[PDB]
Amino acid sequence: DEFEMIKRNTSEIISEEELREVLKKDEKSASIGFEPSGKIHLGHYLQIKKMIDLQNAGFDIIIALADLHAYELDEIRKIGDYNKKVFEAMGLKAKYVYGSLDKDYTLNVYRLALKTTLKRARRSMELIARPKVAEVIYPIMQVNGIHYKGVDVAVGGMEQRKIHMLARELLPKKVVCIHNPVLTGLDGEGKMSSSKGNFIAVDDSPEEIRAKIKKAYCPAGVVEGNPIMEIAKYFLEYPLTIKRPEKFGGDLTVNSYEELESLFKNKELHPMDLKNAVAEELIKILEPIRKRLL
Amino acid sequence: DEFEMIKRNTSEIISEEELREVLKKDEKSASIGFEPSGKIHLGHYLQIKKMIDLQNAGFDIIIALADLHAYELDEIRKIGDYNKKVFEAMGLKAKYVYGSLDKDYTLNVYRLALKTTLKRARRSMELIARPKVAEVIYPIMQVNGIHYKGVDVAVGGMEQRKIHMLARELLPKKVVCIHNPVLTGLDGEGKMSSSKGNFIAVDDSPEEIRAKIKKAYCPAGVVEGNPIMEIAKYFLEYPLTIKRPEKFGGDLTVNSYEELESLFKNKELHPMDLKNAVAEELIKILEPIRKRLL
């Protein structure tokens, strides 16, 4: 089912019913924005896979390259083109836009500012709510950068939701907003970030994938905040066979993450064995993508 | 003396001391911004006269035509060039600049906004300081639109004083600010306004100038908020001969406005005589300008 395919593994969909109605149009666009990253990791990949879900539903995909660090990009500029290679290599075909800031720019920005109120604008800020005028204007500038220029759907992590909630109030365009979960990093602290070695870059070698996974936070029986279980949920295909030592009961067949979840919850699956599986499966899954470097 | 000629009839000079230093420079420029106006009246003329004072001291004069009603392209630009002909007719030859909206534009505002704070921004507002986000951003946008791009001196009315003092806090280069008084309108309420019949337009006919001055607010003995006294101060030459019937004391010669101020304040000069002198002198003064109509 196309709707269910889009919903699978999302945190929320503003206007579910709205999304359905969007699906009926022949021509339909989705955007997502990524701040360019020196490394593309599983966090990025989780999103692209969602864009790919939409692509498969006949969405025209738009990827906005987000430099709002305009406060150099002769340097940022093809970290962008590189990311582009990676998204192409993950099998995503889309049209690219970047920060550019044409003449009509300040006009609509101010028009949005006419509508938002200081109380409203403050609600919209991240948690260093506490003030410079830049901090109050910024979110309206972010709302403007949303590629709503004819898109029916906008996608992003749950961390963007405050802004997304604003954009829905402010835009002449009612846009469906789609949130992906955020991956926990390997060390079990915050979100997967290309810092703390808690990331898996989609281009890591087998040796490295194994190494990083071996060190990762994975408490036995525990599923919340378990990054190895997250990787299992978001990336792997089922049924899945887990190879194991005889002292731990030999090969184990899971037909779904739900079946796997209970098996770990009851400590029928040890972390050592779960990590070993996720490593090998992940390797197989990134390997075709990694191979798109001649 | 160059400094004293500049100071004459100004309400204030930020850094009288700083202005002295500027006068010593070999090359110096000065700007003013005007909202394009259908009618050019004595309020405009008072400023233009002050720019001419600066021009005579070896300043290059720059006039910015200020369209910040961008929230049309066509209507605004030509009302401007008609104004331009009027300033030329007043004997001002200057360099003109118009509202644009650059690539660098929003970048420059935001740097300003970074530095400005909510409380400060509020202080700078008209007193519907009391709120949409546009209200808070507006001041920074005005600041940016002070063409300070390389001027030593900026000029404007006292109504602009809140923003000019903010601009002094915020701009990278300290610009000297010079403020001209606000002319009271003919009916004696607010500033001279091209409406309510309380203006004298630079191209008004003798009969019209006479009519408007005849009905103008001028209580005997009273100097504050007396628009007729103001016109006498800012526009007339002394010694000034006031024509009168012999029955009303005959012709009268006043050597300075101060002498004239005391004459009126002690009711030794009648309003009806004062209006007639201001009207008749004003006509002689404006006639050459009026006639520069192609």
Q: Report d(CA A283, CA A267) in Å as an integer.
A: 25
Dist CA A166 CA A293 (whole Å): 40
For CA atoms B191, B170, B111, B180, give the dihedral sign.
Answer: positive
Paired residues of B254 in beta bridges:
B240
HEC letters along chain A: CHHHHHHCCCCEECCHHHHHHHHCCCCCEEEEEECCCCCCEHHHHHHHHHHHHHHHCCCEEEEEECCCCCCCHHHHHHHHHHHHHHHHHCCCCCEEEECCCCCCHHHHHHHHHCCCEHHHHHHCCCCCCCCEHHHHHHHHHHHHHCCCCCCCEEEEEHHHHHHHHHHHHHCCCCCEEEEECCCECCCCCCECCCCCCCCCECCCCHHHHHHHHHHCCCCCCCCCCCHHHHHHHHHCCCCEEECCCHHHCCCEEECCHHHHHHHHHCCCCCHHHHHHHHHHHHHHHHHHHHHCCC
Q: Specify whether the CB–CB gap between B80 and B44 falls below 8 A.
A: no
DSSP state of B216: S
A133, A136, A141, A170: best mutation site toward chain B, by most B Cβ within 10 Å?
Answer: A133
Burial of B207 (0-12, 13-18, 19+ CB in 10 A): exposed
**Nearest alpha-carbon partner for A202 in A43, A77, A33:** A43
Cα of B22 to nearest chain A Cα, Å:
32
CB atoms within 10 A of CB B110: 20
A-B interface: how many C-beta pairs under 8 angstroms?
Answer: 76
SS3 for B64? Answer: strand
Helices A133-145, A105-113: crossing angle, 10 deg rounding: 120
Distances (CA, A) of B221 to A43, A101, B266: 81, 60, 6
Cβ contact A137–B133 (<8 Å):
yes
Q: To the nearest 10°, report the CA torsion of A221, A223, A227, A233.
A: 120
Report A:88-117 residues touching B (Cβ under 8 A). 101, 103, 105-107, 109-111, 113-117
State the Cα–Cα distance between residues A129 and A136, nearest whole angstrom.
Answer: 10
Q: What is the DSSP letter of B150?
A: S
Tokens 């049209």 sit at which residue? A95
Q: Could you tell me how far CA A183 lies from the centroid of its own chain? A: 8
Which two tokens mark A105? 């720019």
Rounded to whole angstroms, how far apart are CA atoms B294 and B291? 8
Q: Which residues contact A94 (CB under 8 A, 6 or more apart)?
A: A51, A55, A60, A61, A62, A63, A87
Tell me how far apart the alpha carbons of residues A48 and A58 are, in angstroms, rounded to a whole number. 15
Instruction: List C-alpha distances in Å: B252 to A165, B148, B181, B277.
Output: 75, 47, 28, 10
User: What technique determined this structure?
Assistant: X-ray
Gap from B138 CA to chain A (nearest CA, Å) = 9
B132, A109: Cβ pair inside 8 Å?
no
Distance of residue B115 Cα from the nearest chain A Cα, in angstroms = 7
Residue pair B22/B28 in contact by the 8 Å Cβ criterion: yes
Q: Cβ–Cβ contacts within 10 Å for residue A196, how many?
A: 12
Query: What domains are there in chain B, each with its CATH number?
Result: 1-183 (3.40.50.620), 184-294 (1.10.240.10)
Q: Which of A59, A66, A65 is nearest to A152 (CA)?
A: A59
Q: Are strands B252-254 and B240-242 parallel, antiparallel or unpaired?
A: antiparallel
What is the Cα–Cα distance from B131 to B118, expressed in whole angstroms?
Answer: 12
Phi, psi of B13 (to 5 degrees): -125, 120
DSSP state of B248: G
Helix (H, G, I), strand (E, B) or coil at B21: helix
Q: Is A124 exposed, middle or buried (0-12, 13-18, 19+ CB in 10 A)?
A: buried
**Which two tokens mark A125?**
């800020």
CA distance B125 to B113: 15
Resolution of the PDB structure in angstroms: 3.0
**Which residues in A lie closer than 8 A to residue B71 (C-beta atoms)?**
107, 110-111, 114
Measured distance CA(B194)–CA(B176) in Å, rounded: 29
- Half-sphere exposure of residue B242: CA atoms within 13 angstroms, side-chain side: 27
Rounded to the nearest angstrom, the minimum Cα separation between A20 and chain B is 35
